[PDB]
């Protein structure tokens, strides 16, 4: 009997259909505790303590964990982040320079904290010129509603909640084009991978299989009503927002997974960790993170 705790996050993306369908549990035979986390920092803590065995991390929390030598490996990509993550601001902030002196919320060390710092650098704004505050996404929504922040760099469901009355100043497709791309990945603890390698393979299979029909034809996938409703329920967003969110990333075929896990992910961790170090967020980094990536489960 195998028990596994999976830390998941709120991005509306096609693999959530397999989560809703319980496919990983059914195919693997394991009892699966799917636990929602608000952002990647708390997932890193839970992976490090052993309370979570498989977790969904943004590339920035991944780089923090790898720099701390947490015994985890990326074993598949979830998505290449685009405008599903965005900087949404009060409508009177009209230009990047208007951010000076404003209060902008991000969950610390998340991909949107990272992207905010990369965007400020691109715009020639020192981070200390902005009051960057640490809040988790539910608290960001509450602070926005009360007028206590001027904007936030967020993912769903906060990004769409804020965009209802706000303006998108930049997004992670643009920030990626500026040279700071971000990813969402799935990681596994070494001790779990050692003990239950076929369960890890079953997790990868369920996620990869679920994304392929979307990749093959996005519009056909999006018109199957149960695909929309499953993502709306698990992400906590209205059905009307699901298509724009799903199209706000790209996803990987099995061939792309193997290719990305054999070099590109390592390079992504190296570069992400180095920028975090330059920004003062990690004290020390390595020139190689191959211990933190594997293609053996895809």
From Swiss-Prot:
One of its GO terms (molecular function) is transmembrane transporter activity. It is found in: Periplasm. It comes from the Bacteria. SMART domains: PBPb (SM00062). SUPFAM superfamilies: Periplasmic binding protein-like II (SSF53850). The keyword Transmembrane helix does not apply. Keywords: Periplasm, Signal, Transport. One of its GO terms (cellular component) is outer membrane-bounded periplasmic space. It holds the Pfam family OpuAC. GO terms for biological process: cellular response to sulfate starvation; cellular response to sulfur starvation; taurine transmembrane transport. CDD domains: PBP2_taurine. The keyword Ribosomal protein does not apply. InterPro entries: ABC_Gly_betaine_transp_sub-bd, Peri-bd_TauA, Solute-binding_3/MltF_N. Induction: Repressed by sulfate or cysteine. Belongs to the bacterial solute-binding protein SsuA/TauA family. Part of a binding-protein-dependent transport system for taurine. This is Taurine-binding periplasmic protein. It comes from Escherichia coli (strain K12).
């Amino acid at each position: 009997m195998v028990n596994v705790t999976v830390a998941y996050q709120t991005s509306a993306e096609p693999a959530k259909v397999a989560q809703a369908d319980n496919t990983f549990a059914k195919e693997s035979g394991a009892t699966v505790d799917w636990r929602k986390f608000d952002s990647g920092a708390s997932i890193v803590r839970a992976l490090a303590s052993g309370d979570v065995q498989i977790g969904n991390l943004g590339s920035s929390p991944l780089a923090v964990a790898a720099s701390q030598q947490v015994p985890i490996e990326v074993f598949l990509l979830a998505s290449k982040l685009g405008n599903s993550e965005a900087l949404v601001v009060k409508k009177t902030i009209s230009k990047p320079e208007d951010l000076i002196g404003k209060r902008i919320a991000v969950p610390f060390i998340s991909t949107t904290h990272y992207s905010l710092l990369a965007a400020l650098k691109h715009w020639g704004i020192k981070p200390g010129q902005v009051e960057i505050v640490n809040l988790q996404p539910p608290a960001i929504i509450a602070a926005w509603q009360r007028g206590d922040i001027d904007g936030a760099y967020v993912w769903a469901p906060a990004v769409n909640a804020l965009e209802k009355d706000g303006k998108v100043l930049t997004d992670s497709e643009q920030v990626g084009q500026w040279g700071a791309p971000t990813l969402d990945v799935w990681v596994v603890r070494k001790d779990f991978a050692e003990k239950h390698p076929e369960v890890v393979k079953a997790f990868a299979k369920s996620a990869i299989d679920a994304q392929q029909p979307y990749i093959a034809n996005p519009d056909v996938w999006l018109k199957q009503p149960e695909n929309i409703s499953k993502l709306a329920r698990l992400s906590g967003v209205p059905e009307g927002d699901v298509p724009g969110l799903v199209k706000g990333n790209t996803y990987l075929t099995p061939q792309q997974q193997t290719a990305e896990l054999t070099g590109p992910v390592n390079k992504a961790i190296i570069d992400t960790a180095q920028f975090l170090k330059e920004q003062g967020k990690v004290p020390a980094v390595a020139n190689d993170y191959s211990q933190y990536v594997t293609s053996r489960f895809v």
